[PDB]
């Protein structure tokens, strides 16, 4: 299947408690491989996956430079946005950026991304054509006119089709024994009496990679779209993921319910029954 | 000094592997779906803050909401209870979520 | 590979 590379950066002001903090992380699919933290001691881009440690000292110098520069840029961008919105310096504000690319099984470019959020909501984003911008409000329209005048989209298009793609393919090769694997979910069901009249059936999916998965309950073959409790997919901490889905059932009716698991590491979707 | 639409963290406390008394494991507290990103997370052993807890680098989801994993090595036993304590601007008081080996 | 160019709002 396809693969993605993403970098996520967060800049947070903390008025009266220091200068803004900048954190950046890089992912291939659901595997983190680098980070930078403006508060940390090293002041360096740091490895977080075995397969990136082989990159030489010039990789780390160049990457450290680009991310420290982004850090300074977004620090100034918080000041600019404050001014655009005429917001008070007392407030704590947030600037998030996401960029990266998708490639197919043959490694061809599938999609690029370059987008910003301010205080948790859309600010400006590069459209799929990699030629135009979507601006969320009047402040971002100022930025949009600025970036149109400086041809910023041409530079981001070039990065996304060129360097971003080349890096992803390279990372996919160097970490092939780790990144191109799938781990199928290990599955089971637990049963927890509520009262004398009701019990919870919980359907479990453990140790899977990648994180994408679907768990659904059926009663006599019919979906239980809204009496189902679902938790957010969570990391185990070892590079695999976990999720469960629960349904409240009247005691004696446990056998009418089926749980259904879809994951790309499965050749066929699973059906589980108490 | 919160700014933007506030979202209360979703909190899950769980072990990396199915718990077995006397076997080393990892205790996790995953907080997700929250804004703003200012947050405090601790793991508790019998109501007492565990000292050497580590956490993942701040990251966020497609909807821009943040997530963090806090974790520590541990060895479950019969008598010992564990929990996660979270403080966030959306919470009127710190929220304590007990570890239940069945969730 | 990180972006080579950041620019101002």
Author numbering:
A (entry chain A): 1 to 274
B (entry chain B): -3 to 99
C (entry chain C): 1 to 9
The authors write:
Here, we identified the HLA-A24-high binding, immunodominant epitopes in SARS-CoV-2 spike region that can be recognized by seasonal coronavirus-specific CD8+ T cells from HLA-A24+ UHDs. Furthermore, to elucidate the molecular basis of cross-reactive TCRα/β recognition between SARS-CoV-2 and seasonal coronaviruses, we examined the structure of SARS-CoV-2 peptides and the relevant peptides of seasonal coronaviruses bound to the HLA-A*24:02 molecule. The crystal structures of HLA-A*24:02 and three peptides, namely, SARS-CoV-2, 229E, and HKU1, were determined. Overall, we found that the potential of cross-reactivity may depend on the interaction between TCR and the structure of specific HLA, i.e., HLA- A*24:02.
